Amino acid sequence: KGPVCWRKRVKSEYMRLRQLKRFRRADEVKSMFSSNRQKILERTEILNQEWKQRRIQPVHILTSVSSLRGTRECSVTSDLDFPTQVIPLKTLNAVASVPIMYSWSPLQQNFMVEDETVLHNIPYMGDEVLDQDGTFIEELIKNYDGKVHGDRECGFINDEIFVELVNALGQYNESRPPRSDKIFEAISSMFPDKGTAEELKEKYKELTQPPECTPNIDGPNAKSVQREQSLHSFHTLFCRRCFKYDCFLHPFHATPNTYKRKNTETALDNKPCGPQCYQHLEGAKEFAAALTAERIKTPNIEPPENVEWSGAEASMFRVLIGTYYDNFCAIARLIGTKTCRQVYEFRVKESSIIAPAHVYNYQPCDHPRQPCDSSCPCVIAQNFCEKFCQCSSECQNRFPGCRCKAQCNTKQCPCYLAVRECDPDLCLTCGAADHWDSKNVSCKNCSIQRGSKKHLLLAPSDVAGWGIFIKDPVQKNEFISEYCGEIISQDEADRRGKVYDKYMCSFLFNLNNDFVVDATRKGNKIRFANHSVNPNCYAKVMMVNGDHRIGIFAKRAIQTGEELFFDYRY
Amino acid sequence: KCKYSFKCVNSLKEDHNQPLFGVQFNWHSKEGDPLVFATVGSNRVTLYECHSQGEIRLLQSYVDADADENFYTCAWTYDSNTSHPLLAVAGSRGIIRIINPITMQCIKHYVGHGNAINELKFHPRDPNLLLSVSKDHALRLWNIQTDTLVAIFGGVEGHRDEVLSADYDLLGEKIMSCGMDHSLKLWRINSKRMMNAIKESYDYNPNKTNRPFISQKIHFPDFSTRDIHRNYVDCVRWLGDLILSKSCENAIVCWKPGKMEDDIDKIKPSESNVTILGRFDYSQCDIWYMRFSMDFWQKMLALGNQVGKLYVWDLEVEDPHKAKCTTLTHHKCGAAIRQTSFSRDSSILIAVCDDASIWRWDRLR
């Protein structure tokens, strides 16, 4: 085993594999080429046949009427010794140019974006620049550890070719690992733009193809599966905060006591079912409530009816008894294919069967029995616990709502005073909670959450390039819009920042310690608000429902058609 | 041995001295008419007519009254009403001008593009379907009859830096494009969404409705890959259902989406494989913005390199290639050869260079 030994061995295998693959394919490709050539013949023929039907009168030249001694001319000199040809030169007149812009996708709320550890692209500026200072091109590459796609020694790589390189390198190696940990280092160092070694090992895992799938409950191979496996997919993938599965905003998963519920309420008596109920021989309500009172700690004379449980039904019971707790009236009604009676018997059968056996970004805390004390992430982060935290109802570190009568746009509101928009579950009194579709409302500290922005108009800037203009007139301190973009790590900002530093304009706006908003690749209209030191706006970052979100307000009353600017402090 | 042999029958030079970035034979001209071509460079477009033999007649030339403009590419089409030819030129100002060389006037202009147009293309089947690629990272498909923008092929899974080339396939069913981000991208236009967007674009009239035309903004391609090339990919062409594309790795690579077997129209966006069939090795084309071309019947493939040497390969050669190209130099051709253009009949081959020079090479009798 040698560090450079593995590389040379990876190199010569690769070099061999590429050759023996080429000769096998070289047979097949000849057939593919012949075949493809057959496709050409046809489709070219079709166009050519279309060309016959066109009569295009081409090639007309014009000298007359005679040159008035106003127009310039174009000459063309010849190495054939035919005299130099001369033509007056047609002026293609006036067209207003548009300001420069690069294409960008529109957003309503921001977008979390993963770091990229290699810049896939080296920016062409440099010919007119003539490589000065060529130092920039080195220092740009240093931020990426010197990793650019595609910087290697090795001349090519593909997936079908890659898996054979891992398999021919496992054959090569006594054995087995059975899949090595050492070799993923060697094949990354040969391929910087495909590494780190970690990333190649996970790429190999996706490529070689399914447990722990629980199959379809609505389907023909539905298994009888425990509660947590039937629901494994939903709990693991649902976002509590924004209410989507695999959201674009929040990367941390469930916590997992977020998807455990308070067991109460209520456990109340409700009979009859009715009427073919779980009744009424000793053991009906008694042994039901008993079995779970025997199961919590740390009858049934009639012979139990004979019905058969499919894989779906059995799972669906199990999942329901979790959330419905012995209410077999409810469960039976829900399962729909069994009756109150049969659910109870299956419970009984299942109780008797054996199991085989500086500001930071908010991210909720969840230490189940112990309090939000000086070891709590939130209080370490010097942030409140929010609704999404899994601590006490009455934790001392939870932001309470505002009780405000109305607007809550002054210091007397506790929300406004914390640089927070209201909470539509907490601020029940101002009307941050009130009627939704009616998206203008009494509380005027909820506008970011509601996306309730003024109408903005795009035209060229009365200073430079592009600028942005408000349609409808607005007063001092009033909400104009949210500054939206990508969300990225201070690292990935530092990489993109350096490149935008060379273009002498950046669209990065600093959100908190952990994150920056980058309206460059994707954003929204207010991004065209220019930088003016004496601006007609300002940019307040606020805290809204766990997300930190930028807010662009007026700094002054503004006339219709005015161009919006704000100072860039960072 | 090799095929096919040529001899330099002429050379000439424009008056500006700036580079000829683009050169295009008029393939729309009916047989038994003179073989025409156009060149773009400096702030101008020039039109030349070949004559038997050697003689290249200077027909027309046009200068943008904006001093700063600089045309990068041209492409021929026709007015299927009046049966005129129509040349399209685009350049650094991000503005597409349409010249009609029978009226000798710029009859149309489109000014939606953010930055320069590095290539223009016209739909083989539809003489109104212009496709502008750009340094602004989006391709734009226009209907030049209706003054409408059909489709903008850029956004999320669009290109990440400059789009340098694209080609319609032979039937006009899909665009394969490429650019600076190292990436080739495949964009179908036979899909219901596009074919509908195309139709409604014809039906669009601005005196009939207060609305604008609703240009489909396409954010996602039907395929993408970055595993072929290792720097900017500057020219890409459709050889039927295979892809010819060059980066500056001293070869044009013939590859296909997916595995050996996987059919092009059965490829799904998520497809992670490609396969290299062959490479057409050349030498000394290290700079970018070096295009190749092929003849109408796709029997010959021509790339002019940066030291004035033209490489011409045969595409009836089974297997690599490997061997062997028909290499043709001249002792006064030095500058970089931006782009080659065959005449329709493969008799003539034009090339244009950085030094404003134009090189006419004709074939065996």
Binding site: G126, D127 | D286
Partner: peptide
């Protein structure tokens, strides 16, 4: 290893 120029070079 290196970055691409549109023009060579003299």
């Amino acid at each position: 290893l290196q970055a691409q120029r549109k023009f060579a070079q003299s």
